């Protein structure tokens, strides 16, 4: 329950991974756009080879909430050293939200406009 300038993020600090009905370990991040503009967001991790992050580079309409599902690839297990990074920035009202528009946005957005929120993983 983290309240930021651009996004509210659930959970606020620590990710819990539970077993799904298929045996996989999955956790959920929910980003809620608390502004009046589209907010583009990226997810980065300290273990890029390890996690499926669906989605990892998207956008969120004003007042809407978007789910990010995170799971280690089969055979890998969550580790307490693993962290996650949410990067977010407001877009223009007119801009599109395809992969090409998002990629161009992240090249032009100034650094001091990009919110960042860090999350760690619970293990024991």
């Amino acid at each position: 329950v983290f309240k930021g300038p651009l996004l509210h993020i659930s959970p606020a600090e620590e990710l819990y991974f539970g077993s799904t009905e298929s045996g996989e370990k999955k956790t959920l991040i929910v980003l809620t756009n608390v502004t009046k503009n589209i907010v583009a967001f990226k997810v980065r991790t300290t273990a890029p080879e390890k996690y499926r992050v669906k989605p990892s580079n998207s956008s969120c309409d004003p007042g809407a909430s978007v789910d990010i599902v995170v799971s280690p690839h089969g055979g890998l297990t969550v580790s307490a050293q693993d962290r996650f990074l949410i990067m977010a920035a407001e877009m223009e009202q007119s801009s599109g939200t395809g992969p090409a528009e998002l990629t161009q946005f992240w090249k032009e957005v100034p650094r001091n406009k990009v919110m960042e929120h860090r999350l760690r993983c619970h293990t024991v």
Partner: peptide
Amino acid sequence: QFYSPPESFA
């Protein structure tokens, strides 16, 4: 220290 995972868009 933070890296982009395999890209996944909407």
